[PDB]
Ligand binder design. Structure first.
Ligand SMILES: NC(=O)c1ccc[n+]([C@@H]2O[C@H](COP(=O)([O-])OP(=O)(O)OC[C@H]3O[C@@H](n4cnc5c(N)ncnc54)[C@H](O)[C@@H]3O)[C@@H](O)[C@H]2O)c1
Ligand SMILES: NC(=O)c1ccc[n+]([C@@H]2O[C@H](COP(=O)([O-])OP(=O)(O)OC[C@H]3O[C@@H](n4cnc5c(N)ncnc54)[C@H](O)[C@@H]3O)[C@@H](O)[C@H]2O)c1
Lengths: 429, 429
């Protein structure tokens, strides 16, 4: 077994996917036309933060199953199966899926093509893309015997290895049993693998990523109500959570590289295919408005007048245990506070150098305790678990006003009562 | 232990709750101011269809822990705890919760009150109702030492006993440890019991019943999309289903006594308390429009012109294994077909005599095979499991046109291909 694999793309996915494939004993080549990543991996410095990846590559480098390039064709040289892990960002303008990078890459594959390889769209793409590639293959390399599949990916950033190593499931969309037997032979070192049709499998990744955002934004909307009637959303989430058709926690919304656009593309692709998707249509419309309003929640907690005051922020990314600030909630929360004339200390363990390019006018620090140092208030945004065990009593002495806004509901309010702090969570009496 | 219990109300809930309480060995009195129910239970004829209830009452009648009346006070005579299981239907007009029946009953309790009993709202009520009762108690019987609780109920009709006997969870909302110890002492024969505050516990039943409707209407919206792009929603539901944060199946919508109004009251109660609930606000708006459109799905399948043709219906209720036609999908599906001038055979095993009062102009039958007999098409609506094993080949010979519309996706299309039938499910290529 132990076969030849080309991962076109070496970003957050293509790296982690291809690396784990090498741990299965497969012959793996990761490609990226950015040089800096490849000229960082060859230096054995990972570009991004994912736990476990530090060893996982550097290991399989040495055992010699894992290779890096920027030359496409070196990878596509006799590869058994070729994976496409390139970006599918939102098209500036409408919101639809920028499939150009794929369509560029799928083409550049099709020419540099020795054997009847197997083409795997792993990128979160809209539906019938695999049909459209199937034209391009036939357009470029007609008699090359190649087959086109979709196998989407479901990993959470910050748990990518374990998500990949232990999947709930994995999805494969084709009808040609040859390619079915191949993708079987690939994924065989785990022992389930779900075999649907192509367009079905393309639809699932969107449908799931939509549905999670629905679940999050639902309880968030509930959490707003829990405030005004004096309920307690942690109990409520547990209240429905013990159902077998439910594990969900209130927040200032969702974000990340994957989520908020995949909604939007699905919302769009539904529109072109002439069906409404009202629930998901509502879902972003709350969510965009939500994280902004979470900023107004702070101002209300801070009396109402935040002209010229000073605000500490804990956490910056949309998610602990990575650096992916791409569509964080926090930017919207900051920009709200700036718009009412204020000033912004901000700590993130590993987000900063990526966060700086998205952020105007923001004093970053070195330390979470320093973020509160002479602020009018401190906001917790992202639950890096280091925050979960901190000294509350330093902070009361570190503040110009004893005002704390938990937004991931970590700290039990008795502690903030004990340290005499102004408690403000999400969904609280 | 084995204590005195009064269940004010003896409808779909109050019966099944109180009966199961008697099986715990508690002294149980069920009250209803309708006579006919009480003058049916005394004849040992259950009014409604619930599996297991036939024996469960008739048993505990004989062992003498279970009693019936229409006199309220006979039940409230020295009762340890008093349950309110009366109706909370939608207020004709706005849509809000008709809390008059409660407010009538809670009052009539408060006067006929010997001991410091314990008042339990079990009816699906809006929030702070338990606070409003707490006034009425204090208004009427101030020094009577009584406490007011909410313990909502979560059973599905058609599985009520097993739902009650094996709960995922049970909810209790108060802060007075006396009443906490009582409701403990009640529910102790199971061995969890969830103890929240009052308003929180009132909110949960709505939040859950909202959230399920969201889940159903979500995949339904997805199922519409699966049609137009040729996906396969059974695989898709399974595709997301293997997530641990998911077991959901496409339909023509939801209904029943409990669901579609509890949405609406929650939507309303949120409005009075000045927060929007956009997702649930979207959820009904699809759902009302959906089941009607499912009727138009039939017409499209039936060519488009259904003036003067004839249509068979399988299933009528919103749910197999009960008779509760109250807000079925089917009525909307029928009325759509009637509005394009057609004619309607309809079989339901146990819905009919209740269904007749909601339905104009509808030839009911005795038998599912007779519903198709010389129709232009047959529609399956409700999955009574008797339908799951039927002869398809009689039906092709029983039809003026070989047209079948599965709407709960039970029959695998190969069978309908085998019997040469016009296959039409929900979310199909
Ligand atoms: N980030 C996630 O959490 C996640 C999870 C599941 C699926 N996905 C999907 O996977 C895809 C990529 O994810 P990502 O986070 O790593 O995006 P990314 O921007 O971080 O990485 C994509 C990389 O592919 C490279 N690339 C683009 N075109 C190329 C080409 N023609 N040839 C060689 N290399 C090329 C880029 O240099 C880039 O570094 C997206 O479609 C995304 O939706 C992402
Ligand atoms: N039907 C369900 O599936 C379900 C599930 C969970 C919760 N609930 C909730 O429980 C409540 C009742 O449910 P239901 O289906 O049995 O309604 P129901 O109309 O079928 O039964 C209510 C009964 O209570 C009786 N009643 C009304 N006022 C009374 C009074 N003042 N004194 C004595 N008896 C009185 C009525 O005669 C009626 O038969 C509702 O609030 C409902 O939302 C229903």
């Amino acid at each position: 077994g132990s076969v030849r694999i080309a991962m076109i793309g070496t970003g957050y996915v293509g790296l982690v996917s291809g690396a784990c494939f090498s741990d299965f004993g497969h012959e793996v080549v990761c490609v990226d036309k950015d040089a800096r990543k490849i000229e960082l991996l060859h230096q054995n410095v990972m570009p991004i933060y994912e736990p476990g990846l530090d060893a996982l590559v550097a290991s399989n480098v040495k055992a010699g199953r894992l290779s890096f390039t920027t030359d496409l064709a070196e990878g596509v040289k006799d590869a058994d199966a070729v994976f496409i892990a390139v970006g599918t960002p939102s098209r500036r303008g409408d919101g639809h899926a920028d499939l150009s990078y794929v369509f560029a890459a799928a083409r550049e594959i099709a020419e540099n093509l020795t054997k009847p390889s197997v083409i795997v769209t792993k990128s979160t793409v809209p539906v019938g893309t695999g049909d459209e590639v199937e034209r391009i293959i036939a357009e470029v390399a007609p008699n090359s015997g190649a087959k086109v599949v979709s196998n989407p990916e479901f990993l959470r950033e910050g748990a990518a290895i374990e998500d990949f190593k232990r999947p709930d499931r994995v999805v494969v969309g084709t009808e040609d049993e040859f390619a079915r037997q191949v993708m079987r032979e690939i994924y065989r070192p785990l022992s389930p693998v779900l075999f649907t049709g192509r367009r079905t499998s393309e639809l699932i990744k969107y449908a799931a990523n939509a549905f999670l955002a629905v679940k999050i934004t639902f309880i968030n909307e509930i959490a707003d109500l829990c405030e005004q009637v004096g309920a307690d959303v942690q109990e409520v989430s547990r209240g429905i959570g013990m159902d077998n058709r439910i594990f969900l926690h209130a927040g200032p919304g969702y974000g990340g590289s994957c989520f908020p656009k995949d909604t939007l593309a699905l919302m769009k692709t539904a529109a072109d295919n002439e069906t409404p998707l009202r629930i998901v249509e509502a879902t972003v419309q709350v969510n965009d408005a939500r994280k902004r309003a979470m900023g107004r929640k702070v101002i209300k907690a801070m009396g109402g007048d935040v002209r010229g005051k000073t605000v500490g922020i804990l956490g910056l990314t949309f998610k602990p245990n990575t650096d992916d600030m791409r569509d964080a909630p926090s930017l919207s929360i900051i920009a709200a506070l700036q718009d009412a004339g204020a000033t912004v200390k901000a700590y993130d363990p590993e987000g900063v150098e990526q966060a700086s390019k998205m952020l105007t006018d923001v004093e970053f620090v070195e330390n979470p305790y320093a973020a509160a140092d002479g602020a009018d208030a401190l906001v917790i945004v992202t639950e890096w678990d280091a925050f979960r065990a901190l000294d509350l009593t330093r902070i009361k002495n570190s503040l110009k006003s004893p005002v704390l806004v938990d937004l991931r509901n970590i700290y039990p309010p008795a502690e903030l009562e004990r340290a005499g702090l102004q408690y403000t969570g999400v969904g609280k009496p």
